[PDB]
Amino acid sequence: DRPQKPFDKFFIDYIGPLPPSQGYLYVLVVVDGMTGFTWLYPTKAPSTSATVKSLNVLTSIAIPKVIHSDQGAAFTSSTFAEWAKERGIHLEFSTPYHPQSSGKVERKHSDIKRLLTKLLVGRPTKWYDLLPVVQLALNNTYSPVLKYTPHQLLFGIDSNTPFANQDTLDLTREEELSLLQEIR
Template sequence: MNLSDHSKSIHENIRQLKESVNKLGEVIHDCETCAAIKQAKRVKPLWYGGRWSKYKYGEAWQIDYITLPQTRQGKRYVLTMVEATTGWLETYPVPHATARNTILGLEKQVLWRHGTAERIESDNGTHFKNSLINTWAREHGIEWVYHIPYHAPAAGKVERHNVVV
């Protein structure tokens, strides 16, 4: 390969790289998740400046599942539930992260101990986002809010507790 061919090859690769970067920019621009994250970064975090101040104790919760080593009783997952105004943590170990176990955990650890919540926030996992959960929340008058996917700050309270657990 002579110098002329080499230069043409390099310039062609640079041109293709620029085209790829431009296409990537278009994909990111059109992505709903990326747009939601960008919008969330523009405004102050949801918990900033008293996001939870309109709620009384026990009315707002953030929940998530974490995976731990399996116990002798066969429980491998823990439903973590954080009360939003105080940061109070409730946990409920289960063998499987399912909608049914989510409801059982919420009833035993939240509703029976702290009263009926007005708002529950969670990620978009299948154990949270399904018709069983939707029906249960509607029957109890609970607003169920799903976080922006792949945006950990939206679930800040529960994610901070998950690190400790």
């Protein structure tokens, strides 16, 4: 079979609800399967229309062959199916109750959750403005498996923000407290 390439498959999923940030409550996470490159879109709801609007932005830059998701209602609607069909995108779904398909992707999901927790200490409603910072960190994070950052694999060049990732990889005490205080 043919080697894996950027745009073969985008894995998508919702993260949230998060504290309200400029009206927004969720992040739609899109990860390119081959490169690990991540795109983040704030939404007000985990709905088909929010997904379509966000993905209309992404697909004005690049269209995947396949989108992979869990069986979230936003993704299994006939509207989303027609949206995909219009663009020649094949929709692939994980079986119900097995929503986790790719480890590379799941690692990105926990990286995102961890980076948000670290950045949002003392400013939980400020994540909207911080999305670019998160995205840059993820995409300039060296992959020990692939031996490159997602930026290098997507664009074939080094980046101008090579040290965008300052993740210590575990939460500190104060970071775990701020997360604890938020739920309380």
